[PDB]
Amino acid sequence: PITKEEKQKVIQEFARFPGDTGSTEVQVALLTLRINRLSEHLKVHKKDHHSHRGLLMMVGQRRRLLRYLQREDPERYRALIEKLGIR
Partner RNA sequence: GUGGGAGAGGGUGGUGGAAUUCCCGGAGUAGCGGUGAAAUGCGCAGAUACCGGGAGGAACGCCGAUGGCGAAGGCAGCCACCUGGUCCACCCGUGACGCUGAGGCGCGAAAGCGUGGGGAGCAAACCGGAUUAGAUACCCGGGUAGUCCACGCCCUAAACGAUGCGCGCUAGGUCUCUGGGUCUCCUGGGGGCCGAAGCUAACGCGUUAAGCGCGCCGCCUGGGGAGUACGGCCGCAAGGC
Q: Contact positions toward RNA, by CB under 7 A?
A: 1, 4, 7-8, 11, 19-24, 26-27, 30, 34, 37-38, 41, 44-45, 47-55, 57-58, 64-65, 68, 72
Measured CA distances, 13 to 16, 33, 43, 53 (Å): 9, 13, 27, 29
Q: Is the Cβ of residue 19 or residue 85 nearer to RNA in the bound state? A: 19
Instruction: Quote the least distance from Cβ 78 to RNA, whole Å.
Output: 17
Task: Give residues after which the chain gaps, C-N over 2.5 angstroms.
Answer: none
Rounded to whole angstroms, the Cα distance separating 12 from 20 reads: 9
Nearest residue (CB) to RNA, 17 versus 85:
17
Specify the residue, 11 or 84, whose C-beta has the smaller distance to RNA. Answer: 11
